[PDB]
Amino acid sequence: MAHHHHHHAMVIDHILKCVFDKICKIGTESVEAGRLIELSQEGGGGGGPLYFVVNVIEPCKKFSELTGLVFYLPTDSGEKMTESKSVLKSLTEKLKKIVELIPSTSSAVPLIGKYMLFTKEFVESSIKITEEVINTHHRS
């Protein structure tokens, strides 16, 4: 724990590897539970399994830059982070219409709903981590 060190840039930019590390793990872990749960019910669907990652990572890409604007150009406790939660929630909006493209298994529809929000909830870690810097900064 830093004592006199009040500045944040060299040691604050490293913490990013903590949130960016799991992001790479859960990223591939979700691709499994998503195809494992679906196939279990029927696995129905038009496009292939490559579209799920191409349509999901597509929007996530533009958001990836946010992970660098929070650990580099901080504007608040979650100014740039609050926008990361709107990118995942607003994205599904277009993924829900997929039912008009190649609908399949109406039982798995409500099921995946728990897996979709799951990845969105984990994103909160960005703030849960910084919460440790606000307790030391305001104390130091």
CATH top level label = Mainly Alpha
Q: CATH H-level name... which superfamily?
A: Neurotransmitter-gated ion-channel transmembrane domain
Sheet with most strands = none
Please work out how many helical segments DSSP would assign. 7
Question: What string gives the helices and strands in order?
Answer: HHHHHHH
**Large-scale geometry:** elongated
The CATH architecture comes to Up-down Bundle
In the CATH hierarchy, the third-tier topology is known as Methane Monooxygenase Hydroxylase, Chain G, domain 1
Radius of gyration: 18 Å
Number of domains: 1
Specify the helix fraction band: 55-70%
How many β-strand stretches?
Answer: 0
- Class inferred from helices and paired strands: mainly alpha
**Amino- and carboxy-terminal Cα gap:** 10 Å
Q: So what's the oligomer here?
A: monomer
The fraction of residues in strands falls at under 5%
PDB class: signaling protein
Keywords: transmembrane domain, Nicotinic acetylcholine receptor, signaling protein
Assembly: monomeric
Entry title: WSA minor conformation
